[PDB]
PDB file of N, CA and C in Angstrom:
ATOM      1  N   UNK B   1     118.035  59.281  88.413  1.00 35.63           N
ATOM      2  CA  UNK B   1     117.253  60.442  87.903  1.00 35.63           C
ATOM      3  C   UNK B   1     116.225  59.996  86.888  1.00 35.63           C
ATOM      4  N   UNK B   2     114.991  60.466  87.035  1.00 32.87           N
ATOM      5  CA  UNK B   2     113.887  60.131  86.121  1.00 32.87           C
ATOM      6  C   UNK B   2     113.135  61.411  85.876  1.00 32.87           C
ATOM      7  N   UNK B   3     112.469  61.512  84.739  1.00 31.56           N
ATOM      8  CA  UNK B   3     111.750  62.684  84.380  1.00 31.56           C
ATOM      9  C   UNK B   3     110.277  62.600  84.807  1.00 31.56           C
ATOM     10  N   UNK B   4     109.798  63.660  85.521  1.00 30.80           N
ATOM     11  CA  UNK B   4     108.421  63.681  85.978  1.00 30.80           C
ATOM     12  C   UNK B   4     107.765  65.040  85.761  1.00 30.80           C
ATOM     13  N   UNK B   5     106.433  65.015  85.834  1.00 29.92           N
ATOM     14  CA  UNK B   5     105.628  66.218  85.717  1.00 29.92           C
ATOM     15  C   UNK B   5     104.982  66.402  87.084  1.00 29.92           C
ATOM     16  N   UNK B   6     105.287  67.532  87.677  1.00 27.60           N
ATOM     17  CA  UNK B   6     104.741  67.831  89.020  1.00 27.60           C
ATOM     18  C   UNK B   6     103.603  68.783  88.889  1.00 27.60           C
ATOM     19  N   UNK B   7     102.414  68.317  89.241  1.00 29.19           N
ATOM     20  CA  UNK B   7     101.147  69.105  89.137  1.00 29.19           C
ATOM     21  C   UNK B   7     100.714  69.569  90.506  1.00 29.19           C
ATOM     22  N   UNK B   8     100.688  70.882  90.682  1.00 27.84           N
ATOM     23  CA  UNK B   8     100.370  71.426  91.970  1.00 27.84           C
ATOM     24  C   UNK B   8      99.106  72.396  91.878  1.00 27.84           C
ATOM     25  N   UNK B   9      98.156  72.209  92.775  1.00 30.71           N
ATOM     26  CA  UNK B   9      96.976  73.022  92.883  1.00 30.71           C
ATOM     27  C   UNK B   9      97.003  73.808  94.159  1.00 30.71           C
ATOM     28  N   UNK B  10      96.891  75.153  94.024  1.00 30.08           N
ATOM     29  CA  UNK B  10      96.921  76.008  95.181  1.00 30.08           C
ATOM     30  C   UNK B  10      95.545  76.636  95.456  1.00 30.08           C
ATOM     31  N   UNK B  11      95.416  77.139  96.664  1.00 34.67           N
ATOM     32  CA  UNK B  11      94.188  77.829  97.123  1.00 34.67           C
ATOM     33  C   UNK B  11      93.919  78.910  96.093  1.00 34.67           C
ATOM     34  N   UNK B  12      92.747  78.935  95.475  1.00 35.93           N
ATOM     35  CA  UNK B  12      92.410  79.915  94.478  1.00 35.93           C
ATOM     36  C   UNK B  12      92.189  81.328  94.974  1.00 35.93           C
ATOM     37  N   UNK B  13      92.190  81.510  96.278  1.00 36.50           N
ATOM     38  CA  UNK B  13      91.977  82.822  96.921  1.00 36.50           C
ATOM     39  C   UNK B  13      93.222  83.557  97.313  1.00 36.50           C
ATOM     40  N   UNK B  14      94.392  83.071  96.894  1.00 35.08           N
ATOM     41  CA  UNK B  14      95.638  83.702  97.299  1.00 35.08           C
ATOM     42  C   UNK B  14      95.925  84.945  96.433  1.00 35.08           C
ATOM     43  N   UNK B  15      96.565  85.948  97.027  1.00 31.88           N
ATOM     44  CA  UNK B  15      96.902  87.154  96.239  1.00 31.88           C
ATOM     45  C   UNK B  15      98.310  86.852  95.607  1.00 31.88           C
ATOM     46  N   UNK B  16      98.607  87.584  94.578  1.00 30.24           N
ATOM     47  CA  UNK B  16      99.906  87.389  93.875  1.00 30.24           C
ATOM     48  C   UNK B  16     101.093  87.302  94.802  1.00 30.24           C
ATOM     49  N   UNK B  17     101.039  87.977  95.946  1.00 28.05           N
ATOM     50  CA  UNK B  17     102.120  87.945  96.927  1.00 28.05           C
ATOM     51  C   UNK B  17     102.218  86.595  97.619  1.00 28.05           C
ATOM     52  N   UNK B  18     101.085  86.075  98.108  1.00 29.50           N
ATOM     53  CA  UNK B  18     101.041  84.818  98.818  1.00 29.50           C
ATOM     54  C   UNK B  18     101.325  83.672  97.807  1.00 29.50           C
ATOM     55  N   UNK B  19     100.899  83.893  96.565  1.00 26.60           N
ATOM     56  CA  UNK B  19     101.028  82.921  95.498  1.00 26.60           C
ATOM     57  C   UNK B  19     102.543  82.751  95.266  1.00 26.60           C
ATOM     58  N   UNK B  20     103.256  83.860  95.208  1.00 27.65           N
ATOM     59  CA  UNK B  20     104.702  83.871  94.952  1.00 27.65           C
ATOM     60  C   UNK B  20     105.440  83.137  96.080  1.00 27.65           C
ATOM     61  N   UNK B  21     105.002  83.299  97.329  1.00 28.77           N
ATOM     62  CA  UNK B  21     105.611  82.633  98.431  1.00 28.77           C
ATOM     63  C   UNK B  21     105.535  81.111  98.252  1.00 28.77           C
ATOM     64  N   UNK B  22     104.344  80.652  97.916  1.00 23.50           N
ATOM     65  CA  UNK B  22     104.130  79.185  97.740  1.00 23.50           C
ATOM     66  C   UNK B  22     105.026  78.694  96.615  1.00 23.50           C
ATOM     67  N   UNK B  23     105.137  79.448  95.490  1.00 23.16           N
ATOM     68  CA  UNK B  23     105.962  79.026  94.386  1.00 23.16           C
ATOM     69  C   UNK B  23     107.449  78.977  94.823  1.00 23.16           C
ATOM     70  N   UNK B  24     107.875  79.936  95.638  1.00 24.40           N
ATOM     71  CA  UNK B  24     109.257  79.964  96.101  1.00 24.40           C
ATOM     72  C   UNK B  24     109.539  78.762  97.012  1.00 24.40           C
ATOM     73  N   UNK B  25     108.560  78.399  97.818  1.00 24.96           N
ATOM     74  CA  UNK B  25     108.704  77.258  98.724  1.00 24.96           C
ATOM     75  C   UNK B  25     108.753  76.004  97.916  1.00 24.96           C
ATOM     76  N   UNK B  26     107.949  75.927  96.834  1.00 27.06           N
ATOM     77  CA  UNK B  26     107.920  74.783  95.936  1.00 27.06           C
ATOM     78  C   UNK B  26     109.292  74.641  95.252  1.00 27.06           C
ATOM     79  N   UNK B  27     109.829  75.777  94.813  1.00 25.68           N
ATOM     80  CA  UNK B  27     111.113  75.818  94.152  1.00 25.68           C
ATOM     81  C   UNK B  27     112.227  75.293  95.083  1.00 25.68           C
ATOM     82  N   UNK B  28     112.150  75.707  96.339  1.00 23.95           N
ATOM     83  CA  UNK B  28     113.201  75.291  97.289  1.00 23.95           C
ATOM     84  C   UNK B  28     113.044  73.807  97.554  1.00 23.95           C
ATOM     85  N   UNK B  29     111.822  73.297  97.650  1.00 23.52           N
ATOM     86  CA  UNK B  29     111.615  71.906  97.870  1.00 23.52           C
ATOM     87  C   UNK B  29     112.162  71.084  96.703  1.00 23.52           C
ATOM     88  N   UNK B  30     111.883  71.507  95.509  1.00 22.82           N
ATOM     89  CA  UNK B  30     112.380  70.811  94.326  1.00 22.82           C
ATOM     90  C   UNK B  30     113.920  70.712  94.348  1.00 22.82           C
ATOM     91  N   UNK B  31     114.552  71.805  94.698  1.00 23.11           N
ATOM     92  CA  UNK B  31     116.048  71.792  94.762  1.00 23.11           C
ATOM     93  C   UNK B  31     116.512  70.936  95.889  1.00 23.11           C
ATOM     94  N   UNK B  32     115.831  70.991  97.042  1.00 23.03           N
ATOM     95  CA  UNK B  32     116.211  70.276  98.228  1.00 23.03           C
ATOM     96  C   UNK B  32     116.079  68.771  98.050  1.00 23.03           C
ATOM     97  N   UNK B  33     115.120  68.337  97.202  1.00 24.28           N
ATOM     98  CA  UNK B  33     114.923  66.909  96.984  1.00 24.28           C
ATOM     99  C   UNK B  33     115.646  66.388  95.741  1.00 24.28           C
ATOM    100  N   UNK B  34     116.595  67.184  95.242  1.00 23.06           N
ATOM    101  CA  UNK B  34     117.432  66.798  94.110  1.00 23.06           C
ATOM    102  C   UNK B  34     116.897  66.988  92.723  1.00 23.06           C
ATOM    103  N   UNK B  35     115.831  67.750  92.568  1.00 19.01           N
ATOM    104  CA  UNK B  35     115.207  67.957  91.256  1.00 19.01           C
ATOM    105  C   UNK B  35     115.890  69.013  90.428  1.00 19.01           C
ATOM    106  N   UNK B  36     115.891  68.797  89.091  1.00 15.31           N
ATOM    107  CA  UNK B  36     116.415  69.705  88.113  1.00 15.31           C
ATOM    108  C   UNK B  36     115.136  70.159  87.421  1.00 15.31           C
ATOM    109  N   UNK B  37     114.857  71.493  87.577  1.00 15.84           N
ATOM    110  CA  UNK B  37     113.619  72.006  86.893  1.00 15.84           C
ATOM    111  C   UNK B  37     113.937  72.363  85.440  1.00 15.84           C
ATOM    112  N   UNK B  38     113.273  71.654  84.541  1.00 15.40           N
ATOM    113  CA  UNK B  38     113.483  71.912  83.090  1.00 15.40           C
ATOM    114  C   UNK B  38     112.457  72.899  82.502  1.00 15.40           C
ATOM    115  N   UNK B  39     111.258  72.891  83.027  1.00 17.33           N
ATOM    116  CA  UNK B  39     110.236  73.815  82.528  1.00 17.33           C
ATOM    117  C   UNK B  39     109.154  74.051  83.552  1.00 17.33           C
ATOM    118  N   UNK B  40     108.656  75.281  83.606  1.00 19.83           N
ATOM    119  CA  UNK B  40     107.595  75.654  84.553  1.00 19.83           C
ATOM    120  C   UNK B  40     106.455  76.300  83.789  1.00 19.83           C
ATOM    121  N   UNK B  41     105.193  76.043  84.199  1.00 19.72           N
ATOM    122  CA  UNK B  41     104.076  76.593  83.543  1.00 19.72           C
ATOM    123  C   UNK B  41     103.069  77.054  84.594  1.00 19.72           C
ATOM    124  N   UNK B  42     102.579  78.266  84.505  1.00 19.09           N
ATOM    125  CA  UNK B  42     101.594  78.787  85.398  1.00 19.09           C
ATOM    126  C   UNK B  42     100.288  78.669  84.652  1.00 19.09           C
ATOM    127  N   UNK B  43      99.509  77.653  84.941  1.00 21.68           N
ATOM    128  CA  UNK B  43      98.248  77.378  84.273  1.00 21.68           C
ATOM    129  C   UNK B  43      97.106  78.270  84.748  1.00 21.68           C
ATOM    130  N   UNK B  44      97.114  78.592  86.067  1.00 20.11           N
ATOM    131  CA  UNK B  44      96.109  79.467  86.573  1.00 20.11           C
ATOM    132  C   UNK B  44      94.851  78.768  87.101  1.00 20.11           C
ATOM    133  N   UNK B  45      93.726  79.428  87.180  1.00 23.04           N
ATOM    134  CA  UNK B  45      92.500  78.927  87.697  1.00 23.04           C
ATOM    135  C   UNK B  45      91.792  77.906  86.789  1.00 23.04           C
ATOM    136  N   UNK B  46      91.365  76.796  87.427  1.00 26.87           N
ATOM    137  CA  UNK B  46      90.631  75.746  86.764  1.00 26.87           C
ATOM    138  C   UNK B  46      89.619  75.213  87.779  1.00 26.87           C
ATOM    139  N   UNK B  47      88.479  74.722  87.251  1.00 29.03           N
ATOM    140  CA  UNK B  47      87.438  74.165  88.112  1.00 29.03           C
ATOM    141  C   UNK B  47      87.906  72.741  88.412  1.00 29.03           C
ATOM    142  N   UNK B  48      87.934  72.383  89.698  1.00 28.12           N
ATOM    143  CA  UNK B  48      88.355  71.055  90.117  1.00 28.12           C
ATOM    144  C   UNK B  48      87.429  69.905  89.807  1.00 28.12           C
ATOM    145  N   UNK B  49      87.933  68.699  89.679  1.00 26.97           N
ATOM    146  CA  UNK B  49      87.106  67.503  89.407  1.00 26.97           C
ATOM    147  C   UNK B  49      86.108  67.419  90.555  1.00 26.97           C
ATOM    148  N   UNK B  50      86.540  67.825  91.720  1.00 31.76           N
ATOM    149  CA  UNK B  50      85.686  67.861  92.905  1.00 31.76           C
ATOM    150  C   UNK B  50      86.289  68.904  93.880  1.00 31.76           C
ATOM    151  N   UNK B  51      85.443  69.593  94.631  1.00 30.08           N
ATOM    152  CA  UNK B  51      85.929  70.626  95.560  1.00 30.08           C
ATOM    153  C   UNK B  51      86.883  70.121  96.636  1.00 30.08           C
ATOM    154  N   UNK B  52      87.858  70.946  96.929  1.00 28.62           N
ATOM    155  CA  UNK B  52      88.884  70.607  97.979  1.00 28.62           C
ATOM    156  C   UNK B  52      88.881  71.767  98.919  1.00 28.62           C
ATOM    157  N   UNK B  53      88.740  71.472 100.230  1.00 26.94           N
ATOM    158  CA  UNK B  53      88.680  72.521 101.255  1.00 26.94           C
ATOM    159  C   UNK B  53      87.570  73.496 100.981  1.00 26.94           C
ATOM    160  N   UNK B  54      86.417  73.003 100.505  1.00 24.93           N
ATOM    161  CA  UNK B  54      85.225  73.838 100.194  1.00 24.93           C
ATOM    162  C   UNK B  54      85.376  74.751  99.005  1.00 24.93           C
ATOM    163  N   UNK B  55      86.458  74.579  98.268  1.00 23.54           N
ATOM    164  CA  UNK B  55      86.685  75.428  97.072  1.00 23.54           C
ATOM    165  C   UNK B  55      86.539  74.630  95.842  1.00 23.54           C
ATOM    166  N   UNK B  56      85.625  75.026  94.890  1.00 22.09           N
ATOM    167  CA  UNK B  56      85.434  74.316  93.653  1.00 22.09           C
ATOM    168  C   UNK B  56      86.501  74.585  92.573  1.00 22.09           C
ATOM    169  N   UNK B  57      87.321  75.595  92.861  1.00 25.27           N
ATOM    170  CA  UNK B  57      88.383  75.951  91.942  1.00 25.27           C
ATOM    171  C   UNK B  57      89.766  75.857  92.587  1.00 25.27           C
ATOM    172  N   UNK B  58      90.781  75.836  91.779  1.00 22.43           N
ATOM    173  CA  UNK B  58      92.126  75.730  92.258  1.00 22.43           C
ATOM    174  C   UNK B  58      93.063  76.467  91.291  1.00 22.43           C
ATOM    175  N   UNK B  59      94.241  76.932  91.771  1.00 24.72           N
ATOM    176  CA  UNK B  59      95.207  77.606  90.997  1.00 24.72           C
ATOM    177  C   UNK B  59      96.231  76.594  90.610  1.00 24.72           C
ATOM    178  N   UNK B  60      96.412  76.313  89.298  1.00 27.54           N
ATOM    179  CA  UNK B  60      97.349  75.322  88.882  1.00 27.54           C
ATOM    180  C   UNK B  60      98.746  75.726  88.451  1.00 27.54           C
ATOM    181  N   UNK B  61      99.728  74.931  88.914  1.00 27.96           N
ATOM    182  CA  UNK B  61     101.135  75.125  88.597  1.00 27.96           C
ATOM    183  C   UNK B  61     101.624  73.806  88.062  1.00 27.96           C
ATOM    184  N   UNK B  62     102.533  73.854  87.082  1.00 29.85           N
ATOM    185  CA  UNK B  62     103.076  72.650  86.442  1.00 29.85           C
ATOM    186  C   UNK B  62     104.579  72.731  86.305  1.00 29.85           C
ATOM    187  N   UNK B  63     105.281  71.647  86.564  1.00 26.31           N
ATOM    188  CA  UNK B  63     106.720  71.635  86.403  1.00 26.31           C
ATOM    189  C   UNK B  63     107.162  70.347  85.730  1.00 26.31           C
ATOM    190  N   UNK B  64     108.142  70.471  84.873  1.00 29.67           N
ATOM    191  CA  UNK B  64     108.742  69.240  84.262  1.00 29.67           C
ATOM    192  C   UNK B  64     110.111  69.222  84.945  1.00 29.67           C
ATOM    193  N   UNK B  65     110.384  68.107  85.605  1.00 28.42           N
ATOM    194  CA  UNK B  65     111.672  68.025  86.310  1.00 28.42           C
ATOM    195  C   UNK B  65     112.272  66.649  86.137  1.00 28.42           C
ATOM    196  N   UNK B  66     113.548  66.541  86.479  1.00 30.23           N
ATOM    197  CA  UNK B  66     114.281  65.288  86.472  1.00 30.23           C
ATOM    198  C   UNK B  66     114.786  65.214  87.906  1.00 30.23           C
ATOM    199  N   UNK B  67     114.502  64.122  88.556  1.00 28.41           N
ATOM    200  CA  UNK B  67     114.883  63.962  89.962  1.00 28.41           C
ATOM    201  C   UNK B  67     114.996  62.500  90.337  1.00 28.41           C
ATOM    202  N   UNK B  68     115.646  62.227  91.453  1.00 27.77           N
ATOM    203  CA  UNK B  68     115.786  60.830  91.902  1.00 27.77           C
ATOM    204  C   UNK B  68     114.425  60.264  92.238  1.00 27.77           C
ATOM    205  N   UNK B  69     114.107  59.059  91.685  1.00 27.11           N
ATOM    206  CA  UNK B  69     112.791  58.472  91.967  1.00 27.11           C
ATOM    207  C   UNK B  69     112.571  58.177  93.446  1.00 27.11           C
ATOM    208  N   UNK B  70     113.669  57.908  94.175  1.00 27.06           N
ATOM    209  CA  UNK B  70     113.545  57.598  95.579  1.00 27.06           C
ATOM    210  C   UNK B  70     113.268  58.844  96.456  1.00 27.06           C
ATOM    211  N   UNK B  71     113.129  59.993  95.844  1.00 26.42           N
ATOM    212  CA  UNK B  71     112.826  61.226  96.607  1.00 26.42           C
ATOM    213  C   UNK B  71     111.517  61.850  96.207  1.00 26.42           C
ATOM    214  N   UNK B  72     110.864  61.303  95.179  1.00 25.44           N
ATOM    215  CA  UNK B  72     109.567  61.840  94.715  1.00 25.44           C
ATOM    216  C   UNK B  72     108.476  61.839  95.766  1.00 25.44           C
ATOM    217  N   UNK B  73     108.293  60.684  96.438  1.00 25.94           N
ATOM    218  CA  UNK B  73     107.270  60.624  97.499  1.00 25.94           C
ATOM    219  C   UNK B  73     107.542  61.637  98.576  1.00 25.94           C
ATOM    220  N   UNK B  74     108.796  61.697  99.041  1.00 23.22           N
ATOM    221  CA  UNK B  74     109.126  62.640 100.091  1.00 23.22           C
ATOM    222  C   UNK B  74     108.849  64.068  99.658  1.00 23.22           C
ATOM    223  N   UNK B  75     109.162  64.378  98.396  1.00 22.12           N
ATOM    224  CA  UNK B  75     108.900  65.723  97.827  1.00 22.12           C
ATOM    225  C   UNK B  75     107.453  66.037  97.855  1.00 22.12           C
ATOM    226  N   UNK B  76     106.625  65.081  97.376  1.00 21.23           N
ATOM    227  CA  UNK B  76     105.188  65.274  97.326  1.00 21.23           C
ATOM    228  C   UNK B  76     104.664  65.522  98.730  1.00 21.23           C
ATOM    229  N   UNK B  77     105.088  64.747  99.650  1.00 21.01           N
ATOM    230  CA  UNK B  77     104.685  64.913 101.077  1.00 21.01           C
ATOM    231  C   UNK B  77     105.068  66.296 101.569  1.00 21.01           C
ATOM    232  N   UNK B  78     106.269  66.707 101.228  1.00 19.89           N
ATOM    233  CA  UNK B  78     106.756  68.031 101.626  1.00 19.89           C
ATOM    234  C   UNK B  78     105.863  69.153 101.119  1.00 19.89           C
ATOM    235  N   UNK B  79     105.413  69.027  99.890  1.00 19.12           N
ATOM    236  CA  UNK B  79     104.609  70.033  99.203  1.00 19.12           C
ATOM    237  C   UNK B  79     103.186  70.048  99.783  1.00 19.12           C
ATOM    238  N   UNK B  80     102.648  68.841 100.069  1.00 18.71           N
ATOM    239  CA  UNK B  80     101.302  68.739 100.596  1.00 18.71           C
ATOM    240  C   UNK B  80     101.097  69.282 102.011  1.00 18.71           C
ATOM    241  N   UNK B  81     102.243  69.427 102.716  1.00 17.72           N
ATOM    242  CA  UNK B  81     102.249  69.917 104.080  1.00 17.72           C
ATOM    243  C   UNK B  81     101.855  71.348 104.174  1.00 17.72           C
ATOM    244  N   UNK B  82     101.921  72.083 103.056  1.00 18.01           N
ATOM    245  CA  UNK B  82     101.560  73.476 102.999  1.00 18.01           C
ATOM    246  C   UNK B  82     100.049  73.617 103.109  1.00 18.01           C
ATOM    247  N   UNK B  83      99.562  74.518 103.935  1.00 18.21           N
ATOM    248  CA  UNK B  83      98.151  74.713 104.143  1.00 18.21           C
ATOM    249  C   UNK B  83      97.468  75.205 102.808  1.00 18.21           C
ATOM    250  N   UNK B  84      98.179  75.964 102.069  1.00 20.61           N
ATOM    251  CA  UNK B  84      97.612  76.509 100.760  1.00 20.61           C
ATOM    252  C   UNK B  84      97.773  75.580  99.575  1.00 20.61           C
ATOM    253  N   UNK B  85      98.407  74.437  99.760  1.00 21.70           N
ATOM    254  CA  UNK B  85      98.521  73.509  98.666  1.00 21.70           C
ATOM    255  C   UNK B  85      97.328  72.535  98.761  1.00 21.70           C
ATOM    256  N   UNK B  86      96.512  72.520  97.755  1.00 23.39           N
ATOM    257  CA  UNK B  86      95.303  71.704  97.743  1.00 23.39           C
ATOM    258  C   UNK B  86      95.503  70.301  97.181  1.00 23.39           C
ATOM    259  N   UNK B  87      96.442  70.169  96.276  1.00 21.15           N
ATOM    260  CA  UNK B  87      96.683  68.879  95.656  1.00 21.15           C
ATOM    261  C   UNK B  87      98.083  68.849  95.035  1.00 21.15           C
ATOM    262  N   UNK B  88      98.739  67.664  95.097  1.00 18.77           N
ATOM    263  CA  UNK B  88     100.027  67.451  94.497  1.00 18.77           C
ATOM    264  C   UNK B  88      99.928  66.114  93.801  1.00 18.77           C
ATOM    265  N   UNK B  89     100.246  66.100  92.494  1.00 18.21           N
ATOM    266  CA  UNK B  89     100.197  64.917  91.719  1.00 18.21           C
ATOM    267  C   UNK B  89     101.434  64.856  90.845  1.00 18.21           C
ATOM    268  N   UNK B  90     102.285  63.840  91.071  1.00 20.07           N
ATOM    269  CA  UNK B  90     103.515  63.698  90.332  1.00 20.07           C
ATOM    270  C   UNK B  90     103.362  62.462  89.440  1.00 20.07           C
ATOM    271  N   UNK B  91     103.603  62.667  88.095  1.00 19.99           N
ATOM    272  CA  UNK B  91     103.431  61.584  87.125  1.00 19.99           C
ATOM    273  C   UNK B  91     104.708  61.480  86.316  1.00 19.99           C
ATOM    274  N   UNK B  92     104.968  60.274  85.817  1.00 20.91           N
ATOM    275  CA  UNK B  92     106.169  60.096  84.977  1.00 20.91           C
ATOM    276  C   UNK B  92     105.911  60.789  83.626  1.00 20.91           C
ATOM    277  N   UNK B  93     106.918  61.512  83.161  1.00 25.70           N
ATOM    278  CA  UNK B  93     106.862  62.222  81.908  1.00 25.70           C
ATOM    279  C   UNK B  93     106.659  61.228  80.754  1.00 25.70           C
ATOM    280  N   UNK B  94     105.676  61.528  79.887  1.00 24.19           N
ATOM    281  CA  UNK B  94     105.437  60.647  78.741  1.00 24.19           C
ATOM    282  C   UNK B  94     105.846  61.276  77.446  1.00 24.19           C
ATOM    283  N   UNK B  95     105.637  62.608  77.378  1.00 26.20           N
ATOM    284  CA  UNK B  95     106.030  63.356  76.179  1.00 26.20           C
ATOM    285  C   UNK B  95     106.645  64.645  76.677  1.00 26.20           C
ATOM    286  N   UNK B  96     107.935  64.581  77.080  1.00 28.92           N
ATOM    287  CA  UNK B  96     108.690  65.722  77.608  1.00 28.92           C
ATOM    288  C   UNK B  96     108.910  66.833  76.639  1.00 28.92           C
ATOM    289  N   UNK B  97     108.929  68.035  77.190  1.00 31.31           N
ATOM    290  CA  UNK B  97     109.178  69.245  76.372  1.00 31.31           C
ATOM    291  C   UNK B  97     110.707  69.343  76.161  1.00 31.31           C
ATOM    292  N   UNK B  98     111.101  69.772  74.956  1.00 30.21           N
ATOM    293  CA  UNK B  98     112.508  69.942  74.670  1.00 30.21           C
ATOM    294  C   UNK B  98     112.947  71.327  75.109  1.00 30.21           C
TER     295      UNK B  98
END
């Protein structure tokens, strides 16, 4: 088990209903890949470093989790498979929230 920060960017054109579905799917994936979710943050809309899928903006989600390092890649791949997921970036926690 290692602590990571999971950064997810979603299609900025989703309605709160579709948004919720994606979050629920993300939650299931985290649990399925052995992650313990310690903190979740809904950051919202931000302008991307560069447009993805013709969209200059993205809806940001953040999670601090503890999970097996041998499952992180698989998790990221699982999340990226979603058509509405624009980007997935997992980084090792450097300054974890208590």
